[PDB]
């Protein structure tokens, strides 16, 4: 890799600089190089990895949606919209494949604490979901099954090893509920999961830790926002 000659500690340092400079493509490359050293990532480093690739893929998804909207509104012209949409789509799929490969090759494993294992499996579900947003046909069915299995496996760990207010548990349940509703066409599954997730968090809210109150309540509000949207 282009980062293979750089020390892990310098890669982490450069990822942090790239975040300060809002150079998220650089940040992701630096964090990919850190992952490929084969050492474990701390909570803080996992956040750097997550922030870098979410910004990269997030910008691609927004672009793909803009172009796809114009493409559909050219069906009520030449091939240029489809071509450029397909170009952005292909780039989006490449970044997701890169993330899924890092997860499969280096980060997902049986060892480690609950935060790490749930976080990586949630990420696997999330990046299969982003592939699902642009997939078609038999490819889309395969991708959706993969996201679901990843998400379910994360859920099984989070329910056994994490409290119902844990922000990583909550963010996973929120994203799994979005998967059910927006991707797998299972609105009832989505509504039920969000409701249970909110209720079990609300019943334990008094136990909240100062280091986690902000995250937990925000995810809870998003669950409620989605339920208002879906019901």
């Amino acid at each position: 890799g282009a980062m293979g000659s750089m020390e892990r500690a310098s890669l982490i340092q450069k990822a942090k600089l790239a975040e300060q400079a809002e150079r998220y493509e650089d940040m992701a490359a630096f964090m990919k190089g850190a992952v490929e050293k084969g050492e474990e990532l701390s909570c803080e480093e996992r956040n750097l990895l997550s922030v870098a690739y979410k910004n990269v893929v997030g910008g691609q998804r927004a672009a793909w949606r803009v172009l796809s909207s114009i493409e559909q509104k050219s069906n009520e012209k030449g091939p240029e919209v489809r071509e450029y949409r397909e170009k952005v789509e292909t780039e989006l799929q490449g970044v997701c494949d890169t993330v899924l490969g890092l997860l499969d090759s280096h980060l997902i494993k049986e060892a480690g604490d609950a935060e790490s294992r749930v976080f990586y499996l949630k990420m696997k579900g999330d990046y299969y979901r982003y592939l699902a947003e642009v997939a078609t046909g038999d490819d889309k069915k395969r991708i959706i099954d993969s996201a679901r299995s990843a998400y379910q496996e994360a859920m099984d760990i989070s329910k056994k090893e994490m409290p119902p207010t844990n922000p990583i548990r909550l963010g996973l349940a929120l994203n799994f509920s979005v998967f059910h509703y927006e991707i797998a066409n299972s609105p009832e599954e989505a509504i039920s999961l969000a409701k249970t997730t909110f209720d079990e968090a609300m019943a334990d809210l008094h136990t909240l830790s100062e280091d986690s109150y902000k995250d937990s309540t925000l995810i809870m509000q998003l669950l409620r926002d989605n339920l208002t949207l879906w019901t």
């Binding site: 979410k54 997030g58 994203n175 509920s177 927006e182 989505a190 995250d215 925000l218 995810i219």
Partner: peptide, 9 residues
Amino acid sequence: DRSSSAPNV
């Protein structure tokens, strides 16, 4: 509206 997923913390 699109459903909201977890944000960038």
